[PDB]
Design a protein around this ligand. Structure first.
Ligand SMILES: O=c1ccn([C@@H]2O[C@H](COP(=O)(O)O)[C@@H](O)[C@H]2O)c(=O)[nH]1
Ligand SMILES: O=c1ccn([C@@H]2O[C@H](COP(=O)(O)O)[C@@H](O)[C@H]2O)c(=O)[nH]1
Ligand SMILES: [Zn+2]
Ligand SMILES: [Zn+2]
Ligand SMILES: [Zn+2]
Ligand SMILES: [Zn+2]
Lengths: 549, 549
């Protein structure tokens, strides 16, 4: 009769804004609460966060919030999500490792969220915590692109759920902290009911290169740089940042840092001992008049991602720095899903500015923080789950992980492709989607959350693809109709006179018939809509503005 | 004193719409005239063609048009370009190999362009032709993704220009026709003044896989397909089409073909003997009630590219066919530059529809038709040019080819990164950009060329990114102002009342001052523009519609 309910609100069928709800009877615990960065073409938007209607409604049932690591797509939404769910304070335990909470506290500060306003509980990446009456969570350290990263064995009343968390099996991590697989292998031997695993590189054969390999390559290309060196990466990629710092130090270069979020995350990492710097980190101004060959700039965008700073350096221009011939620019991160070709344009432009650009995959200046097939198969054989739920990847990633699992010695009884908002029921003998709950995203820009909406976005697309047709109609005894367009096909642009004309007949009949301005609007809208369709095969946005006299 | 002028009008700093003008004194010859396929997000547009203002102006100076191969980005623009330059007929020699001209004639037919309306001169892929008094062109066969493909040694009064054309050095081509390098090596020993070479895969190490490797892999994955098989590729990829046909035949599958352009190109290839089919090619209807395992569908979009058919199969739906669980879909081509992540979405959706999708680079079901670094270095050492002009690739490709050349035994004296519209002057001792000429693109949709413009496109983007603010103003003794918006930030949406108000003051002052409706429009536009900027940091499109009384 007993069953666990798994409800993803973000992170399924996508890479970003991870948050997964677990529930047994009337006790809930949440795993992460990340944000997702926006794709280009969606200007204005700073970040996306998952809709948590379900948690707001069941807020009093949440017994704890568990955070796996400090990447923005795992804790970036919290400064927004917490207030939405609990208000400006809460007693609910929010567990996380030292670095993870250090970064979280840093973010909360920025939102005026008091320190102890929330109950942050610092734990070990390998800790064991009891959540309410029904959940015993056994965390285990996993190598990833940030220190203090964990997976978790979720022990429930009906069996074990092994959650790999974000991971790769780096044999030689920069901080010397290898993955701890004892709890995972142990659970495998005892019997794993459900496995939830990182599908990011499920389509990639072999093993993901070690962060140390990148460190060595960065060392090489940097020691080869004739003048200045610019390195872009995510602010939360502490391992990469350390690799860069070591490179800069070895060749006598002072490290300057640009990007609010990275200076912040880096300061915190230094205070807590996760980062070490021979000298100290400097600002752009402090290295202003340094010889080109003794300067290395670590930069990212205001929100933590490299895109915005790369784009400004290449196009609109940056107020604090400018690219010049001879400069070496290294993109030490992969593009946000959807920005791949936006990055290529940036690269093209950086080259045209005279810089020597090194970027992946052409140049080995970056390595994924996720496991490739050999690492995934190892985890699959370690756990031999009865049920499988690929996560942290789009449908193709999830599907390729499913195919990978199906080719193992003891394939899972059943594998499901998880979706955001879906409700999965897990029993000792079954696993199935049994419903859905309100889900989605909320858009965030400077002017707060929601300033941008799905509707606003929908109109922008209808606009961007079909154009606009504005019909100005004066409803009086001497009716007037003017039609103008923009971004509309020239062919249709020559049919506006016919538009104006049919709008006039509608306007006159509307008046003569004492109709309300709204039904007159409809009377104009629908006919012109159909006409331009049956005439140009286009669906421009038709804005009928009907004004009395 | 003598010098050759090279003027690219398309194909430089991009992959697509290739056309290059060569000139000595008053005699011109043109190399190709392709089109470029559109990126998604640029809906409505069917194809892009290069602006040929320069050739229209100097039309009487053109002594011949030379076509290297039948790929759309080399001959696809001709049905549009020829009429624009010569009218509906011309005596000017248009040289091309058998297949190349066969496909060209097929295209011209579709535009009502009479057969002999133009002077198509069929030549051998290894021919030698004299162009006017100053040019002797020595063509040489090069393996590529279509039969009858050539590079060309352009012999001029001041030296030799070796143009590689599109190529890879496939050691085992499907048609058994290997590359002919005798003319290239010969020119290298005599001394090559300028080398123009294919930079597509200049950033890729090693050698491009042979089309035969793909043929074998396609054979494997197809023989593994439980039910129907769908294969998408460009209509002009005759080698790939043959590879697929052989696969289908070996496993007793009848081949159906969808996509006007591919049925057409394939018929022509069959008539001319470039394609061989055990049985015959069928239509969708003819294979309607065939067992799933005995059906293979070769498809592409109406214009020759796979995108539109893949998109319909995955989203909006196709009238002639539908994807069903168990179907195997193979994307046997790479995405158009800018469609990479549009393809990923299609793949995700195809998987969600229940099909087994195989696509590159995850699956080896496709191989580039362009040379990788080892093939390029071979060509570089074969020619050892004094001057170098990488072509057929974006800036990063061009730059990486430049770096590759600079690492050779005898680097070029100087390498230039070519641009469309730039004018390069070549003498025996020099090579330099000395000017520019009107250049660009023209957008083409069903309603003909130009139906879509840069302006229309610009407004669509301004619209798509910033939204819209329509201010309706009635200029009379009882002024009226109404403001409405769409795709505009909620924050700004709350400032429309303030907009209306400042528009009213402008409207009233405009009236009271007898100003013309245009200066009143400006008086409303500019202030509101600045206001919303200084208030929301956004630049929405402001459409002030001022109407008398
Ligand atoms: O905080 C982060 C760090 C990385 N990524 C993205 O996750 C994907 C995998 O990163 P990786 O394989 O390069 O480590 C990429 O699309 C990258 O842009 C994020 O969305 N958020
Ligand atoms: O007629 C064609 C054939 C291929 N391509 C494109 O050329 C690039 C290289 O193709 P390939 O390396 O896969 O052969 C790709 O972006 C592909 O979409 C075209 O633009 N036109
Ligand atoms: Zn992560
Ligand atoms: Zn993650
Ligand atoms: Zn080609
Ligand atoms: Zn080409």
């Amino acid at each position: 009769q007993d069953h666990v309910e798994i409800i993803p609100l973000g992170g399924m069928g996508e890479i970003g804004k991870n948050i997964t709800v677990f529930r047994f009877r009337d006790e809930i615990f949440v795993l992460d609460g990340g944000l997702a960065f926006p794709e280009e073409g969606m200007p204005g938007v700073d970040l996306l966060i998952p809709r948590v209607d379900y948690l707001i409604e069941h807020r009093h049932k949440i017994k704890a919030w568990v955070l796996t690591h400090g990447h923005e797509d795992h804790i970036g939404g919290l400064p927004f999500l917490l207030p939405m769910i609990f208000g400006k304070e809460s007693p609910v335990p929010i567990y996380g490792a030292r670095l993870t909470l250090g970064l979280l506290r840093g973010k909360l500060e920025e939102f005026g969220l008091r320190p102890g306003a929330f109950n942050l509980k610092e734990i070990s990446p390998d800790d064991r915590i009891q959540v309410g009456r029904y959940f015993t969570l056994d965390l285990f350290r996993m190598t990833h692109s940030i220190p203090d990263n964990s997976g978790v064995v979720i022990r429930t009343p009906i069996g074990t759920i092994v959650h790999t968390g974000d991971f790769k099996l780096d044999p030689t991590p920069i901080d010397g902290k290898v993955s701890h697989l004892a709890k995972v292998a142990q659970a495998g031997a005892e019997g794993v009911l459900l496995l939830i695993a990182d599908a990011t590189n499920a389509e990639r054969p072999g093993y993901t290169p070690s962060e140390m390999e990148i460190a060595k390559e960065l060392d090489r290309v940097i020691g080869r740089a004739p003048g200045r060196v610019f390195v872009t990466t995510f602010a939360s990629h502490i391992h990469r940042i350390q690799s860069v710092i070591w490179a800069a130090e070895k060749y006598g270069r002072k490290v300057a840092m640009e990007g609010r979020s990275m200076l912040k995350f880096s300061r915190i990492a230094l205070e807590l001992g996760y980062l070490k710097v021979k000298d100290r980190l400097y600002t752009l101004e402090e290295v202003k008049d340094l010889p080109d060959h003794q300067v290395l700039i670590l930069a990212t965008g205001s929100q933590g991602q490299p895109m915005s700073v790369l784009h400004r350096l290449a196009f609109e221009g940056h107020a604090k720095m400018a690219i010049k011939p001879g400069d070496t620019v290294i993109l030490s991160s992969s593009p946000i899903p959807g920005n791949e070709e936006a990055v290529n344009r940036v690269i093209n432009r950086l080259y045209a500015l005279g810089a020597y650009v090194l970027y992946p995959p052409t140049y080995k200046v970056h390595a994924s923080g996720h496991a490739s097939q050999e690492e995934l198969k190892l985890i699959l054989n370690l756990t031999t789950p009865r049920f499988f739920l690929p996560w942290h990847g789009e449908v193709r990633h999830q599907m390729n992980f499913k195919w990978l699992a199906e080719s193992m010695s003891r394939p899972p009884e059943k594998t499901l492709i998880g979706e955001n908002g879906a409700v999965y029921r897990l029993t000792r003998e079954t696993f199935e989607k049994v419903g859905e709950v309100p889900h989605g995203v909320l858009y965030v820009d400077g002017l707060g959350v929601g300033d941008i909406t799905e509707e606003i976005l929908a109109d922008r697309r209808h606009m961007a693809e079909e154009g606009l047709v504005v019909i100005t109609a004066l409803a009086g005894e001497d009716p007037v109709v003017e039609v103008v367009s923009r971004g509309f096909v020239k062919a249709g642009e020559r049919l506006l006179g016919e538009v104006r004309r049919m709008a006039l007949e509608a306007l006159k009949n509307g008046v003569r018939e004492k109709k309300p301005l709204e039904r007159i609007r409809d009377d104009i809208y629908y006919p012109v809509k159909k006409f331009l369709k049956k005439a140009t095969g286009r669906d421009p946005m038709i804005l009928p503005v009907v004004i009395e006299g």
